[PDB]
Every structure is written in structure tokens, then in C-alpha cells.
Design a protein around this nucleic acid. Sequence first.
RNA 1: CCCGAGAAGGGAGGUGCAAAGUGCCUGAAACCUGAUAGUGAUGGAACGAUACGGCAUGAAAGGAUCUCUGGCAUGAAGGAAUCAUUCGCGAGGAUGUAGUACGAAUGUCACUGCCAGUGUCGUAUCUUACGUUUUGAAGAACGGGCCAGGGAGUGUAUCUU
RNA 2: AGCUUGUAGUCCGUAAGGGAGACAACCCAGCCCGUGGUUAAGGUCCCCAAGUGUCGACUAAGUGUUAAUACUAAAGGGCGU
RNA 3: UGUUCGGGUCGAAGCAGGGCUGUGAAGUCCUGUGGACCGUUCACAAACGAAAAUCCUGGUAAUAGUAGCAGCAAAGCAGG
RNA 4: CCCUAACUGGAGUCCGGUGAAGCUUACAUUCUAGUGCACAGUCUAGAGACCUCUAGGGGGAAGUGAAGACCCCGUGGAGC
RNA 5: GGAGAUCGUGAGCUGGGUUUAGACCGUCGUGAGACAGGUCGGUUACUAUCUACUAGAGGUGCCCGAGGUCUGCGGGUAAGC
Lengths: 151, 337, 138
Amino acid sequence: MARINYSINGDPETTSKAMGSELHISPKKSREVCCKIKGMKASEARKFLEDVIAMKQAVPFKKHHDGSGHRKGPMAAGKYPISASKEILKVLKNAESNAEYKGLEPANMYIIHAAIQRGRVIHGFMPRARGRATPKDTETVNIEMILSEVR
Amino acid sequence: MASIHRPKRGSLAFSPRKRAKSHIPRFRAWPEATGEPKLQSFAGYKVGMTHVIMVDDTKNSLTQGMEISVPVTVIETPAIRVAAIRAYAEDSTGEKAIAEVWAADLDPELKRRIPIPAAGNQAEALENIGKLIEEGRVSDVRAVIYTLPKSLTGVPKKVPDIMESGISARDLGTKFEYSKTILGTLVSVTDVFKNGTLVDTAAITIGKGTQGPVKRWGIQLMKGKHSRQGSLRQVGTLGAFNPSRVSWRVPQMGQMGYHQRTEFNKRILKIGSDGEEVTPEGGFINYGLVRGDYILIKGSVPGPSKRLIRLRDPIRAKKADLGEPNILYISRESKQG
Amino acid sequence: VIDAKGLILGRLASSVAKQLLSGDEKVYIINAEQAIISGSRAATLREYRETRERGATEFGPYFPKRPDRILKRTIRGMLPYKRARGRDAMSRLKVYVGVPYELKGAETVTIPDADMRLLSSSRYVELGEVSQKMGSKF
RNA sequence: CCCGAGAAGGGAGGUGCAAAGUGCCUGAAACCUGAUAGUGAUGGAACGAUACGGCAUGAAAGGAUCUCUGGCAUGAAGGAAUCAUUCGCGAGGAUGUAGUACGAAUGUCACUGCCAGUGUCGUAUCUUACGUUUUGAAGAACGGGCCAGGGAGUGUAUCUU
RNA sequence: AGCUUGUAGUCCGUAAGGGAGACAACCCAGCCCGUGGUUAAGGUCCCCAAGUGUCGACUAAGUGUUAAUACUAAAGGGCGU
RNA sequence: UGUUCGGGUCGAAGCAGGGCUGUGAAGUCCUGUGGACCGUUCACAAACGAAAAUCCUGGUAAUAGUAGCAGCAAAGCAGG
RNA sequence: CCCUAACUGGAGUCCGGUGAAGCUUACAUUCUAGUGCACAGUCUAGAGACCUCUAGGGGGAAGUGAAGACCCCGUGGAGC
RNA sequence: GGAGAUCGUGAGCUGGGUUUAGACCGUCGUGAGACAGGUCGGUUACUAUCUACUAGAGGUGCCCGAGGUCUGCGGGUAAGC
Ligand SMILES: [Mg+2]
Ligand SMILES: [Mg+2]
Ligand SMILES: [Mg+2]
Ligand SMILES: [Mg+2]
Ligand SMILES: [Mg+2]
Ligand SMILES: [Mg+2]
Ligand SMILES: [Mg+2]
Ligand SMILES: [Mg+2]
Ligand SMILES: [Mg+2]
Ligand SMILES: [Mg+2]
Ligand SMILES: [Mg+2]
Ligand SMILES: [Mg+2]
């Protein structure tokens, strides 16, 4: 519904954070993309996410494996989370902008915290058979992202 | 229950029916030597099939002497290079590689398979293997060979296929000295197999993908009213109530084809040297034309065109010397008509 | 290093099992095919052919064929091998057929009480013959 | 003020003792995400009880003759080893040494700075969950997906003790 | 008939711990907590603490290595010993 | 509730973890958060204690990023 | 049907977006035999078992749906 | 040949019979109705969580780092009858 306290706080001297507030994206795929992009630099993470959206590089799905085949190269089951890639790209862009506004250098930032949190769910209905309506939700996700020029 | 009895669907002799672990068939056993020294194996590539009209020479056959049309299989078999000489030490556990010596001179195309061994320990490795044979540690000597498919235009590859071919001689010193003679050279298929003699053809068969139980084991389709109730190409039952588990012997889907298979008593009918003798008009379909020296094998052979075929002299050949064939007509008309 | 030539299979196995459960020594049992099993040859071969062709192919007991692996199996039976003590004891045991090359010139000790001449009958077969009649090569 | 297409949202920044930051007081568990400790791709299951160890913690609320390691005094039940004699076919027994040396614990003197505890893992022994119907339940008998809250001997009249 | 219906005693139900491989009721045992000791039942080749224990015989069949028992085959025969 | 003795913005209740006492029900204490009430002696009352009723209401999983988004009218492509 | 084969369109398989539900005390990589209320993945003794993922059809979970509608009982009903 | 596998096998199929509601024939019953009598007709629900099997992959374990060629602890066969 509203603003979120961060799970992790980097030190404010070398911290450029940015929250993706309650995106309507898939929490499983966004969680996998956040697990992949943690530890990378901002530039290489942006390049990887752009390759993900262009279907050239696949993220490895290790926790939510079902309904996903095995991708080429040295990889297990992996997919191309287009919507998660776009939303995490927007959060990464906002984090780079905050690093610019703080005088910090976005070109050396290492993503030290990048996690998802499920937000409030917009309850829906799906008209099923035999006069029954099961739910169908628009699950929201809060995307945290912390940069820092230290590692 | 008055049981109706049917033989089991498919063979359990070839399980687990998995994808074979190499494009080259491997020989698990070799026949015992019965004469002068020679390589027991050769490797070729399957081109395609044609038919010959050969006078029948098979003794005691119903159609002996009269004309017959025998479906043959032309095989493109260029020279092979005996790369290495490897000796084995036998013990309680089993045969173990005790030493090898590679030929000094080798083809430049071999780098696509393995890095080229240097021309180093040639005389000294040979004297080491001689001392090992003398003291008694050595039991058998085998030769390493590779194809040289750079000449063949119907096979897209140019990397050699490396394989072991046992030498056929009587005394291990005799085997060692013959292997010394043929080490590092090019030996044509006429120096291994003679015209009219049986062989064994092994090769990875035609892959058919993940096929179903009706095609993989030849199980029965559901019949009559059961043909259109929702399960037509599915096995009727996977097991009883007890034991509470599916047996490994139930027919099921899986990898069909691309297995290694050995065919026995495949006769040799012709030892040719020009591909225009057998190449039909328009070439072979999806292959091209024959450009090296070939051998015509009677009947079918496992694998599609272009596949590597390993030829060894027979291990369970029932019949005696068969003599030279008399081909009257190699049918080189078009395969596309 | 135990020389198992002319020794009872069970008595040697029990002695080696207690020695390994003492818990310090790596025990090599050379000449495993020359171990003795008392009883008539027909009954011995009947029991061992029944035990050989017992299990299922996906689950069942894959009882070995080699004499050294059969002696290892028999010593495995008299250990708590599913425990860490048993696992360490089975890792500290090596059985060979004949004399391996690294045990040439080594010193051996044979169990007195597990001797085969303590028996008082001609009814015995060697473990090597049972392994050979189970189809083994050794 | 910056990013954002944006009256969305985010960062920086400020009001406020405190964001308590628009169904906004405190803000549990289930459930979800991340980090730390232990273990982990040779491994056996009512998830725990008891004892002993490895790793991490042990600031407060717990100990300071408390923790670790020894000597000395008194030591209930029990009670050697070794040696000698004699018996016994023998394994061994009896007698003496000797109710000796030892022995739970109770005191005292040195010695030491950890110990109690907490989390996880391993080793040894024991346990096939809970309630119910049952002669008999781990039952292939019935009830429970999980967590929170609500949920079952109360009043009048009358008799008896 | 692990069937049905009685009677005497003792059990389970309502009974731990120790031992029979597991065992409602079979043996020791009826049990507040901690420590030490010695025994009960049963066992001592290994799994498993303690006997490759002693004496005198038997068995050659892997018989057997199964106190009670719902868990263990008879009649008959053997110049087997 | 009557009655005695009290604690609290120098921080009450509640909440998460932990130490100590008690055979135990539970009590008390400490760390963190909190922003206004809370206990105790001697007695007395009750809409007085949950682990369970295919219990009731709410929140939320695993299934699962799975089934469906196909069958009766298979409809879209180029340029701007 | 002997005896199945090839081909077409829609599903399925793979990919992008959207996106539920039903079983569920717990644990769970099993297989054999015994025992146990006499039909055990969890007990006892053995034998196997490196883990994770995808596809497959349904052997087992006395699979799920459901206070059995057959039989009996109830000093229970209704209709005739 | 016979027999076992929950008279193996309906989350595989079928639905012919038996065992629902309708109706007819015969026999019972005053009757409603009944027949271990016959006849005609009569709904087969589920998206597979765990396990087992069948195939296909990703890892770690072993290991100078990598590649290639082999061995054979084992598993399977009816590969023939
Ligand atoms: Mg969504
Ligand atoms: Mg409707
Ligand atoms: Mg009762
Ligand atoms: Mg409550
Ligand atoms: Mg009694
Ligand atoms: Mg009693
Ligand atoms: Mg008892
Ligand atoms: Mg409750
Ligand atoms: Mg589609
Ligand atoms: Mg009922
Ligand atoms: Mg009555
Ligand atoms: Mg079934």
C-alpha cells in the first residue's frame, strides 16, 4: 500500500539505494533476476539485463524451476524474465541516478543488496465451472536495490 | 484366469536403451587369430545402398548358380593410419595399458581431434615395450588407428576418428614385430579384409528421437472400442497391485535409436577403387558421389548414410571359405527415380 | 596384512572384523581365493548360487562374484558398516586375490584359531572355487 | 533539488520528542525475501530424551573457593592386582597377602580462567506422533495444511447430604 | 479356528525399565530424583558388553543355530551313525 | 469488586529473545521496541485458562509460475 | 480386426505475457521379509541409495472426491 | 498345462452380467409390494504432491589442468525357441 523500510542498510557514505515500489510483476522471476544480479557491477548488470530482454542471455532459475527447460551453454533450467528485467532495469537506473546525485560514481558501484519483497495483493476472481469463482490475483512486488562502491 | 500367452514385447537384451556414448562403435571382444599377422578391424563410412545381380555361389542354397539380386551397401573406406602401438599387462584385476608409442609422422588433420604428439620417444618407447614383452608383463598388443575423412566429399567432417584395432597373430613377439612394421603407415582395406569373406559391422544406429512404447517395443494398439476411448498408443497397464512398483521390464517411451549394434556375418562382395563404378546417376541421395576406394557389403548395415562403420572379421562365423563372388551387374541407375 | 591361505572364511572374517573395530590398523587380506569354507561342496555351491541370483535388478542384493569382494562382503556383514565406525572399518580394509605388487616382500600374520586343519573332515571347498563357479574371473 | 513519460513511484532533503508518512497507535504468528552460525551433493526418517565432543555465541539478567588440573584427611555399599600355599582332569576355586591399596561423597590447601547456559552438527543408547473410538492404534480406523482469535457443567424452583 | 462359551490364578486394559529381532498381556521386574556397586532374566565368534571357555559324547544333514507361543509338518521307513 | 500497600513519560501495558527461581502450573529479572496506564496483602465473584469438535471467523501457504488463456467461426501481413 | 503406417489442423513439448484450484499431522531416496487390529516408505533384520532438473504414462501412497446409497442397529422418521 | 500377484491389472480401457430409480411376463400376497425367476432400458469424476519405473540433462564427489584411447567392479538378455 505504502512505503517500505529496507531489509538491509548499507552505510550512507557510499550507499545509493532505490526501491521499485509494488510492481505488478512476477515475484518468482524477479527474485531469480535479483539473485543473479547481486554482486555484479551496475554497468555489467545493465548489459546482462539488456541481453536478457533481447533473449540472448538467460537467467538461471534454480529455486522455482518448474515449467522451465534447460538452456544452452553451461546452465540448468533458465528463462528470460522480460518484465522482471525491465522493472529491475528501471530500479537499477534509479539507483545509478541516486549515486550520481550523491556524488558517488555509478561506474564502480557493486550491487551489494538486491532483493524482492511481495507487496499488497489486489484480490481478483476467475469465473470457473459449476457456479464457482476462484481467486486470480495481481501480485505486487517491492524491489529493493542497494549499490555501493565498496567490496 | 485362462491365461493367453504372448512373448514379451521387445527385447530386454539391449537395456538400458540409452543414447550411445560415442559416435564410434566400440568392440568389446576380438576373435582369436588363425594365421598370419594382420589388423582385425577397419573403419569406413556408410554411403548408401544399391543392388547387384550376382551369380549365386552359396553352397547348398536353393538358388545356387542362378541369377539373384542382392541388396548391397556401398561403404567408403579410404586408407587408415596406424597411429600408436599400445601394449597391455594382464593380471587378476584385468588388462591394463602398460605403455604406448605413437608414430613419429602423423597427419596434420589430427589436431581437430587430439593435439599432435611430438616425434620424440620412437626408438626408446619401442625398446621399452620390447623389454616389457621380454620380461613377461605384456600380454597383448593393440594398434590405434584413425580414419582420414578429409578426402570424402559426402561426409562433411575432416577430423579423424580414433579407435583401437587388435592385431591378429599367434605369438606376442610376432604381434609386436608386425605392429612395428605397420606403425605410422597407411594400410588400405584390402590389407585387412579379402573379397568374399564375412565380417562384423558395428555402428551407432539411426537415432529416432524419444519414441513411444508402440514404436520402441512394438506393443499393441488398443483395439476396437478401446481404440477411441482416450488411450490408443499407451501401454494398458504398468504393473499389478503388488509388487507396488513399476518394473524396468514394462514397455515405456524413451530414446529409440542411436544405439550401438553389432551385425554378424555381413558378407563382402566387392573391393573397388573408383567411385564411378557404383555411384548412380545424380549421385547418392543426400551424400554425393563416391571418390575413394569402397567395399560392397551384402545386405543392410546399422546406421544411416555418412555414419562411421567399424568392420572386424567375424566372431561367430558358422560357414567356411566362401570364395570370390561373380557380380554380373552393379545397379548404378538413379536412386531418385 | 593377513595371509588367508588355508583359513576358515567366517572365523577369519570375525577376527578381522574385531581387529578393525579395535580401530587403528589397515588390514590387507592377500590370497583371498584360497580361503576355506566347511561343509559339503554341493550344499556350499547351492547356498552361494541361491545367494548370487537373489535380488531384483533395480533394488536387490548385488552379491559379488570375485573372491576378494566376497571376503570383503563377509567381513562387511560382521560390522556396523552403516555407522561411521563401520564405514571407517570398511575403508580400512583391503582384500586382494593373489599377492599384489606392493605387498611383495611384506610381513604377514595368520590367525591361529581360524586355521583349516583344526577342522576334522574333508568336507570343504575354497572360496576361489565358489567364486569361479559363480562365474567370476580372478 | 535529482531520476522518471508521469500530480505514479524512488533518492537526497525537511516537519515531528517519535514517521506515527493518509484504514497512518502498539504491530504477534502463519507465509514470503535477505543475512549470520552450523552442516551439506556416501545419505535413513516421529524430527526428541540422556551422555560425550567439533564450530559460533556467552554484554545484561548466572557462578568468582565459581571453572580447569592435582595433593592431603575422613571415606558408606563394594573390593582388587601381584605373590605364596593347597585343591581341582580342566576352565578355575579356597586360604593368606587384605576387608589391605582403592572406592560415591564430605572438608581443606594449592593450581587455573573458564564454566553454567544458548544455536547447530556429529558419535553411543532408547523412542513407529497427538487426541479419539477401541479388548487391542504408528495404523492401510476417525480429526487436523499452517498461524491468530472465538469455542463446551450456566440460572430458577424443589429434594437430599 | 488368532472360533465360541465357562471356571481358578495372574496379567494387559491402567504397567515403566531390562531381555527375547520386532512382540498389549512371554521371562526378570512392579517404578520418586542423582551417584557408586552387585546381581535378576538372558547372553559371552562378529554385528554387541562379556568365553574362538572347560570336561565327556553326538550330528555330516547348513539338520540346527526357534523356552511359552495364534510364530514350530505327520503316519510309515532307514544293513545313516 | 471491597480493603491494605504501591509502580509509572528519569518511561506503564503489550510484543521477540535470553538469565534465575520453582517438581510444575507460573512468577520475577535483563536486552530491544513502545508511548499510557499497571499491580500487590487479606477476602470475594465470574461471560475465568484450548491442541483437537470433517469446529467457527480472518490471514496465508504447498500444489505453481503449474492448469486455463486451443476443439463449436484455425486471421492476419507490408508501409506510414 | 490381422497390424499398424503416413499425412493434416488444434493441443502437448520449448519460448514471452497473464494466471487459479483440489489432497496436505510430521518426516520422507526406497526394496524384500517378518511383526504389528491378521494389507508397513517411518517398527525389527537385511539389501540398496550422490544430489538437483526436464519429459513420459499411471505401478504404489489400502491416491483424491464423500460422516456408505448394500447389511445390521435406533423402544429415529416419512410415504403407501 | 494349471495356479498366484487385493479371485494381479476401472487416477488403464470396456460395461456384456449382477446390485438403484421405469416397464412386462409367471408365481406369491386381500393389498402396498416381493422373488437367491426371466425379459427390455439404464451417468464410469480427478490439472500426479511424494514414491517407483522409463529415457534426456545440470552439478558436485574422485582428480597436477585438459584431451584422447582403453580396462572392467558390476547390471541385462531367450537373442534365440
Ligand atoms: Mg502478475
Ligand atoms: Mg452459473
Ligand atoms: Mg477403554
Ligand atoms: Mg483462545
Ligand atoms: Mg501371565
Ligand atoms: Mg495390572
Ligand atoms: Mg516390556
Ligand atoms: Mg487454535
Ligand atoms: Mg499456442
Ligand atoms: Mg456413517
Ligand atoms: Mg430398545
Ligand atoms: Mg489401477
